[PDB]
């Protein structure tokens, strides 16, 4: 998977959520196997809430992975979504939180 092959390391993450907030931060990827990478998440939401999270991305196809994250700094809510390749330096994030809220964003280098 080319997508999985590009992901190792640090990406700048920006998101918007359903409540009209934005977040800025990073996702750090660590490959674990040919199909899997671990994630650690750090950032801030526009209302001041700090983001501390972690999770795992699993290869689905050449350009798509499914990722589950959990966020101890956000009352342990979770997020499940797809990481899709856009370019060697950009991925897109489309997910739903465990509160049923839509949460999308981008990964950039």
Ligand X SMILES: CC1=N/C(=C\c2cc(F)c(O)c(F)c2)C(=O)N1C
10 binds ligand X (CB under 6 A): no
Give me the DSSP letters along 38-64: EEEEEEEETTS-EEEEEEEEEE-SSSE
27 binds ligand X (CB under 6 A): yes
Residue found by looking up tokens 């950009």 in the block: 90
Tokens of 21: 């907030």
Segment interacting with ligand X, rule: CB under 6 A, options 28-36, 45-53, 59-67, 80-88 = 45-53
Tell me: does residue 73 bind ligand X (CB under 6 A).
no
Binding characters for ligand X, 47-66, by CB under 6 A (x = yes): ----x-x-------------
The length of the chain in residues reads 109
The nearest distance, CB 102 to ligand X, in angstroms, is 10
The pair of structure tokens assigned to 4 is 């999985």
Residue 93 parent element (H or E): strand 90-97
State the nearest-atom distance from the C-beta of 33 to ligand X, in Å: 22
Read off the tokens for 93: 């994030």
91 binds ligand X (CB under 6 A): no
Burial class of residue 46 in the structure, from the number of CB atoms within 10 Å of its CB (0-12 exposed, 13-18 middle, 19+ buried): middle
Interface positions with ligand X (CB under 6 A):
13, 15, 17, 21, 23-27, 41, 43, 45, 51, 53, 71, 74, 77, 79, 97, 103
């Amino acid at each position: 998977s080319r997508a999985a092959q590009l992901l190792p390391g640090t990406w700048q993450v920006t998101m918007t959520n359903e409540d009209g907030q934005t977040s800025q931060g990073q996702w750090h990827f660590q490959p674990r196997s040919p199909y899997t990478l671990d994630i650690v998440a750090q950032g801030t939401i526009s209302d001041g809430r700090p983001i501390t999270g972690y999770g795992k991305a699993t290869v689905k196809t050449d350009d798509t992975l499914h990722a589950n994250l959990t966020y101890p700094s956000l009352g342990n809510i979770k997020a499940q979504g797809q990481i899709t390749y856009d370019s060697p330096t950009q991925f897109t994030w489309n997910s739903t939180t465990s509160d049923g809220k839509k949460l999308t964003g981008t990964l950039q280098r």
